[PDB]
Amino acid sequence: RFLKVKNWETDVVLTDTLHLKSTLETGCTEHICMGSIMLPTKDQLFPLAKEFLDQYYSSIKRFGSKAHMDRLEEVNKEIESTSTYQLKDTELIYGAKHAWRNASRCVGRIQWSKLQVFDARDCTTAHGMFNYICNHVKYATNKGNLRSAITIFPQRTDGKHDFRVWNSQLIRYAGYKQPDGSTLGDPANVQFTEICIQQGWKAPRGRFDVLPLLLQANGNDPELFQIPPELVLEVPIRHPKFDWFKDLGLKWYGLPAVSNMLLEIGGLEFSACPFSGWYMGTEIGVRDYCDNSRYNILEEVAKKMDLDMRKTSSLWKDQALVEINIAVLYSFQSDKVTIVDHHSATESFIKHMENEYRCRGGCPADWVWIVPPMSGSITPVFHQEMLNYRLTPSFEYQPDPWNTHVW
């Protein structure tokens, strides 16, 4: 019932008691571990509302107070009467911050208490959604001095009036299947790009075309909007030592803004809740650029470095990987756009884990996601045992809206 986690580099041992508060299921059983799998009514709602309100009133040191009991009765009366309830602004902000705090896949959680919460629960149309999103992009970007933010659209009601951002992130690049057989742009975004074109987007058919927003308000058919170009901060990628790197024609955007997840607070479901922080360098340099199914640039870079690509044991892929990641970090830093390297971020996470174990009794963490995708063992998280479990409030995956929407 009490669990220990050890760091095998420092011998530091921490005791986890927070897992006992966990409610949701992991997908593992005593017989099988699914740790590497990517995607493993009124009666329902009151216990969830109560669980949340209890944690909230405990957090402001007013547990069992008159104000606690009164809010519990108020919400109970509201669920019994309306089949749902509304969060106070204080509860919404607490809930959003804790959904981030609880995000076991996120290495950036030392930042969790510093989150700007934009309450968009008064939004009614897709044009309104576009306005809120531009404002979030502008605030979060802050001319390169990035600030963490979330924008929260109205909660699910009966499930036929869902707010959704159809985009997987606020800013991403289009992908196009060519007659050639190859893919132009970002292959990750081929299906969604097709949906936009189908809905009438005039695609430029280039390598780095910022996708338009496809926004769905109140369960209505989604609508297209272009983010003002002047609000999308991009960074041309160059190398501090290699003059030729700039001629690859690479760029990336500064603001990573996940827009397809569902925020659950006190049993309420916020299906449109785009949130943004800043990039860890490996996200762009390792995954976005070097995944075989992404921009897949290792070959081109290695050829420009004149490495021996005849044999895997020359480690040519590894050498070009490091250089690409050096160029990503250098380019963002030179343009004064916030970015964190994987050494700095993982060091910060270990400190955050220690803080959470000390002050909260634990920190749910998914090692498979937390360890960076290059140089794993030279970062301290590789040597850190972690326990993964699901706490609420939470960010959850949800099915893509085009599979589910009724046109």
Ligand X SMILES: C[C@H](O)[C@H](O)[C@H]1CNc2nc(N)[nH]c(=O)c2N1
144 near its own copies (CB under 8 A) = no
**71 is an active site residue:** no
Annotated binding residue 279: yes
Contact map string, positions 263 to 302, toward its own copies, x by CB under 8 A: ------------------x----xx--xxxx----x----
CA separation for the pair 135, 279 (Å, rounded): 20
Which one among 103, 120, 365, 386 touches ligand HEM, defined by CB under 6 A?
103
Which residues does a gap of C–N over 2.5 Å follow in the chain?
40
AA letter at 300: E
CA separation for the pair 373, 367 (Å, rounded): 11
- From 397, 388, 113, select the one nearest 269 (Cα to Cα): 397
Contact map string, positions 377 to 396, toward its own copies, x by CB under 8 A: xx---xxxxxxxx-------
CA 404 to chain centre: 22
Annotated binding residue 169: yes
The single residue of 91, 101, 106, 196 carrying the catalytic annotation is 106
19 near its own copies (CB under 8 A) = yes
**80 is an active site residue:** no
Structure tokens at 273: 């809740």
Number of residues in contact with its own copies under rule CB under 8 A: 64
The single residue of 91, 100, 101, 109 carrying the catalytic annotation is 109
Task: Please report, as ranges, the residues that interact with ligand X according to CB under 6 A.
Answer: 8, 36, 38, 368-369, 382-385
CA separation for the pair 190, 48 (Å, rounded): 38
**294 is an active site residue:** no
Give least dist CB 37 to Zn ion, A. 9
Annotated binding residue 65: no
Residue with tokens 């650029």: 289
210 near ligand 3KJ (CB under 6 A) = no
Give least dist CB 261 to ligand 3KJ, A. 10
Q: Give the residue with the Cβ less far from ligand 3KJ, 280 or 302.
A: 280
Other CB atoms closer than 10 Å to residue 349's CB: what's the count? Answer: 23
- From 216, 100, 196, select the one nearest 156 (Cα to Cα): 216
150 near ligand HEM (CB under 6 A) = yes
Q: Quote the radius of gyration of the chain (alpha carbons, Å).
A: 23
33 near Zn ion (CB under 5 A) = yes
Q: What phi and psi, each to the nearest 5 degrees, are found at residue 177?
A: -80, 130
Annotated binding residue 106: yes
**385 is an active site residue:** no
Which one among 50, 207, 287, 383 touches ligand 3KJ, defined by CB under 6 A?
287
Furthest CA-CA distance within the chain: 74
288 near ligand 3KJ (CB under 6 A) = yes
CA separation for the pair 100, 93 (Å, rounded): 11
The single residue of 100, 166, 252, 278 carrying the catalytic annotation is 278
- Mapping DSSP to helix (H, G, I), strand (E, B) and coil, where does residue 222 land? coil
CA separation for the pair 282, 186 (Å, rounded): 17
- From 188, 182, 214, 191, select the one nearest 201 (Cα to Cα): 214
Please give the annotated binding residues for L-arginine, written as ranges: 169, 278-279, 283
Residues that bind ligand HEM (CB under 6 A): 100, 103, 105-108, 111, 115, 148, 150, 258, 261, 275, 277-278, 280, 283, 340, 345, 369, 395
Please give the annotated binding residues for heme b, written as ranges: 106, 397
Please give the annotated binding residues, written as ranges: 36, 106, 169, 278-279, 283, 368-369, 382, 397
* Residues with active-site annotation: 106, 109, 278, 283
